[PDB]
Amino acid sequence: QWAVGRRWAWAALLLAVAAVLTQVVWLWLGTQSFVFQREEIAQLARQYAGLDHELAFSRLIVELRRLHPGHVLPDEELQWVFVNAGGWMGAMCLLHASLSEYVLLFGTALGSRGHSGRYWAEISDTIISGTFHQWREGTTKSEVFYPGETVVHGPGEATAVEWGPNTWMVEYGRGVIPSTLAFALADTVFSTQDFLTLFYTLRSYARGLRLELTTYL
Amino acid sequence: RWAWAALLLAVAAVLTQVVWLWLGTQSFVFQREEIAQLARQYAGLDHELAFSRLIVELRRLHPGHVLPDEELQWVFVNAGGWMGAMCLLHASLSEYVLLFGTALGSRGHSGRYWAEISDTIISGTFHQWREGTTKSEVFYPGETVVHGPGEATAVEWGPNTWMVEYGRGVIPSTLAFALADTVFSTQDFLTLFYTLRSYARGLRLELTTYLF
Amino acid sequence: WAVGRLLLAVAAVLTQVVWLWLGTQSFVFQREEIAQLARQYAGLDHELAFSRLIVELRRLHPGHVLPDEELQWVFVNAGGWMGAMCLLHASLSEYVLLFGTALGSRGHSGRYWAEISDTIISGTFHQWREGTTKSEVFYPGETVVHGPGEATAVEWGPNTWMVEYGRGVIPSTLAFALADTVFSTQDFLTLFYTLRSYARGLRLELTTYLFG
Ligand SMILES: O=C(NC1CCN(Cc2ccccc2)CC1)c1ccc(I)cc1
Ligand SMILES: O=C(NC1CCN(Cc2ccccc2)CC1)c1ccc(I)cc1
Numbered sequence: 001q002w003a004v005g006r007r008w009a010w011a012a013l014l015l016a017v018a019a020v021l022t023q024v025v026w027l028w029l030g031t032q033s034f035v036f037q038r039e040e041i042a043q044l045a046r047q048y049a050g051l052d053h054e055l056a057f058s059r060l061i062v063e064l065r066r067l068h069p070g071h072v073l074p075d076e077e078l079q080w081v082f083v084n085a086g087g088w089m090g091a092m093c094l095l096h097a098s099l100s101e102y103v104l105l106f107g108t109a110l111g112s113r114g115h116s117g118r119y120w121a122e123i124s125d126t127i128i129s130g131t132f133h134q135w136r137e138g139t140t141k142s143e144v145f146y147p148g149e150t151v152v153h154g155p156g157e158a159t160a161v162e163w164g165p166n167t168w169m170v171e172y173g174r175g176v177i178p179s180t181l182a183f184a185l186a187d188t189v190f191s192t193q194d195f196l197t198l199f200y201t202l203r204s205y206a207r208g209l210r211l212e213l214t215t216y217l
Numbered sequence: 218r219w220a221w222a223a224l225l226l227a228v229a230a231v232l233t234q235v236v237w238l239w240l241g242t243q244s245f246v247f248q249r250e251e252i253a254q255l256a257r258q259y260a261g262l263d264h265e266l267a268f269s270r271l272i273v274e275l276r277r278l279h280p281g282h283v284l285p286d287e288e289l290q291w292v293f294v295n296a297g298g299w300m301g302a303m304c305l306l307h308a309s310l311s312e313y314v315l316l317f318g319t320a321l322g323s324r325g326h327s328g329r330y331w332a333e334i335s336d337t338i339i340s341g342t343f344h345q346w347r348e349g350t351t352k353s354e355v356f357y358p359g360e361t362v363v364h365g366p367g368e369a370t371a372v373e374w375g376p377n378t379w380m381v382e383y384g385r386g387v388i389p390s391t392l393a394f395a396l397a398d399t400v401f402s403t404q405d406f407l408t409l410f411y412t413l414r415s416y417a418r419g420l421r422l423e424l425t426t427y428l429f
Numbered sequence: 430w431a432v433g434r435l436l437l438a439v440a441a442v443l444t445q446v447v448w449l450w451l452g453t454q455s456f457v458f459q460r461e462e463i464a465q466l467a468r469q470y471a472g473l474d475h476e477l478a479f480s481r482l483i484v485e486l487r488r489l490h491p492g493h494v495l496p497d498e499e500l501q502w503v504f505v506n507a508g509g510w511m512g513a514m515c516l517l518h519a520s521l522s523e524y525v526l527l528f529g530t531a532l533g534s535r536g537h538s539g540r541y542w543a544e545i546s547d548t549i550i551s552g553t554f555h556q557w558r559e560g561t562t563k564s565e566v567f568y569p570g571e572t573v574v575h576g577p578g579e580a581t582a583v584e585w586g587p588n589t590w591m592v593e594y595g596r597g598v599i600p601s602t603l604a605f606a607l608a609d610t611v612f613s614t615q616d617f618l619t620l621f622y623t624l625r626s627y628a629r630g631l632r633l634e635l636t637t638y639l640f641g
């Protein structure tokens with residue numbers, strides 16, 4: 001009459017949890033929570049552009065630690081490593097690294113030119129010192145960005161880039177990050193053969209990834 | 218059973234003789250001086266207007282051998298360490314006419330081709346360092362620089378350098394070099410596709426005009 | 430007496446033939462010998478300096494410098510930079526070559542299992558050490574040493590020419606110098622030239638070692 005078979009009820013809950021679980025994973029994926037904001041890294045780095053890049057970097061790192069404790073690499077794991085990709089060369093200092101985000105210090109003391117690359121991500125560069133030249137695809141003119149300005153590099157977009165002597169910046173990336181190192185290490189494999197740098201980069205990502213997991217606990 | 222291979226080779230032998238004859242009776246749409254003198258006259262203009270003026274004039278002199286506006290496209294070129302942009306106007310198996318240059322400037326290996334490459338400069342500078350030499354030469358707007366087949370030099374484009382380029386030789390082979398960095402350095406396969414497509418479009422045009 | 434189912438027997442022999450090998454190693458040039466000599470010719474026109482240096486080098490070490498018929502400028506592409514080299518001496522452990530550019534270049538120094546010192550005859554040499562955010566500049570007369578394992582970013586100005594002496598596991602350094610030649614320029618001809626240059630250095634050294 002008002003009863004329910006205990007056998008039918010057992011299967012109903014299994015169809016229920018299947019329905020609930022499939023709904024739960026979409027809501028969580030949709031949430032898309034990010035640790036940093038695109039305009040925040042740009043606004044924060046703009047303040048230190050007036051200083052010499054050495055003092056600016058050290059001051060910026062200190063500020064970024066107190067804002068987001070547990071999301072920045074410790075001093076013992078901070079390290080400059082060269083970056084060779086797209087035919088240009090620079091140097092990075094990884095500050096933050098997840099599977100969806102990264103924040104790093106980038107720049108050159110000699111300057112360099114090359115292919116920007118096409119990433120499955122959106123990358124924002126804010127100039128602390130020097131110059132950033134950009135040549136968008138399909139155009140015959142270039143633009144130049146000075147200290148205080150920010151150049152954003154959309155996903156799937158390819159440009160030509162040029163850095164002037166002693167150019168430095170704070171960079172924020174957002175997207176499928178492990179796919180980004182695929183381009184960042186292309187010239188390192190086939191042009192420079194610098195496997196020690198290759199180790200440094202992967203170690204920095206790993207130590208950056210380790211931090212994010214343990215902070216989660 | 219040995220008669221099967223004979224017929225397969227006989228029909229292969231005759232087709233090879235057809236190709237050989239056809240390759241021998243070939244005539245060229247464009248002349249070497251034709252492109253050089255036509256370019257030099259627009260070199261005094263800004264490169265944007267120089268290009269558009271030249272394209273139209275090239276269409277007027279050789280109708281059916283220049284790509285339509287809907288198939289014109291700037292595509293990045295990455296080879297020999299340097300980087301520039303290209304816009305293909307004409308392309309067969311033996312000839313090509315394109316616009317080339319860079320808004321930033323670039324340096325690298327000239328590349329060794331199975332072709333003769335001629336570049337008349339509209340703007341900027343072209344620096345050349347010939348193999349075996351310890352001095353460089355510079356070419357300015359209005360001048361034409363010639364890169365012979367087999368030759369390898371070191372090249373340097375100053376900022377905002379542009380040129381009209383006419384190539385004559387085994388054109389499908391030159392593609393091999395121009396996409397070398399694209400595979401091993403830039404990994405820009407979208408650009409690779411753009412390049413191969415613009416070539417196909419050029420081949421399609423020449424084929425249709427030939428057949429009507 | 431029987432032993433059941435050698436490394437100890439093998440390890441002893443191999444280490445004590447390697448240590449015996451390291452002790453019988455003899456270098457043709459001193460660590461600073463090339464640098465002192467090259468320093469004397471800096472400031473001259475690089476072609477004059479090179480010729481004078483080659484004569485003096487042949488005089489100081491007969492049997493270890495390549496003949497005029499085996500001297501050649503070959504393009505070098507590696508780490509994103511491009512230059513030209515003239516090999517003068519080459520073994521498995523040492524090499525002496527003339528290096529430079531007419532246009533200038535920028536790239537990766539490379540990580541060698543060898544120590545490399547460069548004495549500038551003309552131009553400028555910019556060096557950016559790893560882990561630093563500043564660069565240093567060397568002018569004609571100065572010597573830049575590249576220690577084993579070290580990696581820097583280097584830059585040559587237009588008409589920068591130098592004398593280079595390297596010491597260490599030389600064949601491994603050749604792997605780096607041919608990197609861009611193989612994967613970027615596809616210039617097999619230069620790849621042939623360089624390997625031939627190395628072979629000729631090795632041939633001379635083998636002959637000189639055997640028959641004095
Ligand atoms: O070194 C990295 N990434 C490069 C590529 C983006 N910039 C250069 C650039 C290119 C185009 C437009 C703006 C800036 C410099 C940093 C990197 C290191 C570790 C991880 I984990 C992920 C990335
Ligand atoms: O990308 C192409 N060609 C390169 C190599 C020659 N450069 C000019 C140059 C560079 C160095 C020395 C001389 C001339 C322009 C870019 C190319 C694209 C489509 C077809 I179809 C055929 C070739």
Ligand SMILES: O=C(NC1CCN(Cc2ccccc2)CC1)c1ccc(I)cc1
Nearest residue numbers: 505514519524528538583602603606627
């Ligand atoms: O081409 C060679 N080597 C390159 C890289 C080292 N120097 C250039 C240089 C780059 C960075 C810092 C200092 C010097 C000379 C050019 C080479 C050729 C034949 C043999 I056998 C061994 C090496």
